């Protein structure tokens, strides 16, 4: 069987993408952020501290006939941006675009951090990374992709994110109309629990391709593209008036400038990110300094191919025994 759900940018900058997910019987639809950089299905539930909730839809397991408390289980997660959440774990029927998984761990948030509270449009996260990163103790739990994998026509899910437009998440099938040319597949390392791959190089605007290995993670839960300082500096050196502001916390550019594109290698193939995708608008309302879409990964310790890089491609996440990533033009 398959599943097809539409994903939509939360705001005018594509800061995140929410995808509708049905939890329980009768179903309750929550808008979850599909994150291929984490493996937890957590939601804002009726058990959250009423102070940490600001206009979000809440999962009410007491109003669900198929909800079972996963007795004793707890989860504690901290993200790359510094955000965090914790609580107890429930099991319930979860569906994504028609694809149903019965007995899926739905982590009820009892406590959420301030970044989550501010995001009223995001009701929780749907972890699509390897289940080895799941934070449920004492019994580690599997992701929705893992639980659905056996009943899927093909053990894959695809991400087709849009630039200032809605896109799609498909499960169990490859939509041959959603891309042009071929899908280039590349090896994935499951060691750190992420979809870890090696980019074959890069180019800045119409510059000559630089063939160099760049290990990274295909991460839908991260907004920007985070590459090594050497690669990012080469990119921002081609933008007039661009600098790395320590007060902003990253690279800024004059809003009047037209950004060049950024090409990243996938095997012998190339994925071109239009310069427009790299423009995150003014740093503050009315400002003349604009936030860059390419930032350095120096502090993170991992290079991240986030939404900036992924929305320029049709991306296949192959969860076969030998997992691989596929990138195609669109």
With CA atoms as reference, report the closest residue to 63 among 107, 23, 97, 105: 23
Choice among 38, 64, 199, 296 that is catalytic? 199
Longest dimension (CA), the chain: 60
Q: Pairing state of beta strands 304-305 and 243-245?
A: unpaired
In Å, what resolution does this model reach?
2.4
DSSP H or E stretch at residue 310: helix 307-310
Choice among 35, 40, 219, 307 that is catalytic? 35
Angle of CA points 204, 205, 210, to nearest 5°: 35
Active site residue 40: no
Name the 3-class secondary structure at 258.
coil
What is the C-alpha to C-alpha distance for residues 134 and 24, in angstroms, rounded to an integer? 21
Question: What single string gives the DSSP state of each residue in 74-90?
Answer: EEEEE-TTS-EEEEEEE
Active site residue 35: yes
């Amino acid at each position: 069987s398959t599943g097809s759900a539409t994903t939509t940018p939360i705001d005018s900058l594509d800061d995140a993408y929410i995808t509708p997910v049905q939890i329980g019987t009768p179903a309750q639809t929550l808008n979850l952020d599909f994150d291929t950089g984490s493996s937890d299905l957590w939601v804002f539930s009726s058990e959250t501290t009423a102070s940490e909730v600001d206009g979000q839809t809440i999962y009410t397991p007491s109003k669900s006939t198929t909800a079972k408390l996963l007795s004793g289980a707890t989860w504690s997660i901290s993200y790359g941006d510094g955000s965090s959440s914790s609580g107890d774990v429930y099991t319930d029927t979860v569906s994504v675009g028609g694809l149903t998984v019965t007995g899926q761990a739905v982590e009820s948030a009892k406590k959420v951090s301030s970044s989550f509270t501010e995001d009223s449009t995001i009701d929780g996260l749907l972890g699509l990374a390897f289940s080895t990163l799941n934070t449920v103790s004492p019994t580690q739990q599997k992701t929705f992709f893992d639980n659905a994998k056996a009943s899927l026509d093909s053990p894959v899910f695809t991400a087709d994110l849009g630039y200032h437009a809605p896109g799609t998440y498909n499960f169990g099938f490859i939509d041959t109309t959603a891309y042009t040319g071929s899908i280039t597949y590349t090896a994935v390392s499951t060691k750190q629990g992420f979809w870890e791959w090696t980019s074959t190089g890069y180019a800045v605007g119409s510059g000559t391709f630089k063939s160099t290995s760049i290990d990274g993670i295909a991460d839908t839960g991260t907004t920007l593209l985070y590459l090594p300082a050497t690669v990012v500096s080469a990119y921002w050196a081609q933008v007039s008036g661009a600098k790395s502001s320590s007060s902003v916390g990253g690279y800024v550019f004059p809003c009047s400038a037209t950004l060049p594109s950024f090409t990243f290698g996938v095997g012998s193939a190339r994925i071109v990110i239009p310069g427009d995708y790299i423009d995150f608008g003014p740093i503050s309302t009315g400002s003349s300094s604009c936030f860059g879409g390419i930032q350095s990964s120096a502090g993170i310790g991992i290079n991240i191919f986030g939404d900036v890089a992924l929305k320029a491609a049709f991306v296949v996440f192959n969860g076969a025994t030998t997992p691989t990533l596929g990138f195609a033009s669109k």
